[PDB]
Amino acid sequence: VDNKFNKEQQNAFYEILHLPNLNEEQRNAFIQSLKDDPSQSANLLAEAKKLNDAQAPK
Amino acid sequence: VDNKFNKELSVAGREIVTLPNLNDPQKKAFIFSLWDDPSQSANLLAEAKKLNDAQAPK
């Protein structure tokens, strides 16, 4: 029992939506894995951040 | 009643994340309330554009 995952899903959700290279398929799927799984929320933002740089233009 | 409205955060959340007249602190609390209760996600997205008008004309 902790208050980290309570807003980590909130911050990861927000960051998934605010990532400059996340699209509706990546950002919404994250909100599906984030709203259903609270413990993977930080990883979801990390993978969304991971997608932001991988999907980003180079 | 809420039934895992994750798809609604992709449309409501992302539009609340970057609507044309909103600032970063309002969308932050907006998405964080959208994540806690996506039952109002349709109303949150509308609240985002409605609030954007108070800072700038649509």
Curated annotation (Swiss-Prot), chain A:
It is found in: Secreted, Cell wall; Secreted. It comes from the Bacteria. Disruption phenotype: Decreased virulence in mice. Bacteria do not bind IgG. No visible phenotype during growth in liquid culture. Interacts with host TNFRSF1A; this interaction leads to the stimulation of both surface expression and shedding of TNFRSF1A. Each of the immunoglobulin-binding region repeats can bind the Fc region of an immunoglobulin. Cell wall anchoring is conferred by the LPXTG motif and following sequences (residues 482-516) which are necessary and sufficient to target other proteins to the cell wall. The YSIRK-G/S motif in the signal sequence plays a role in the secretion efficiency for SpA, it may have a specialized recognition mode. Disulfide bonds: none annotated. Belongs to the immunoglobulin-binding protein SpA family. Important immunodiagnostic reagent because of its ability to bind the Fab and Fc fragments of a wide range of mammalian immunoglobulins. Plays a role in the inhibition of the host innate and adaptive immune responses. Possesses five immunoglobulin-binding domains that capture both the fragment crystallizable region (Fc region) and the Fab region (part of Ig that identifies antigen) of immunoglobulins. In turn, Staphylococcus aureus is protected from phagocytic killing via inhibition of Ig Fc region. In addition, the host elicited B-cell response is prevented due to a decrease of antibody-secreting cell proliferation that enter the bone marrow, thereby decreasing long-term antibody production. Immunoglobulin-binding region B repeats lie at residues 2-58. This is Immunoglobulin G-binding protein A.
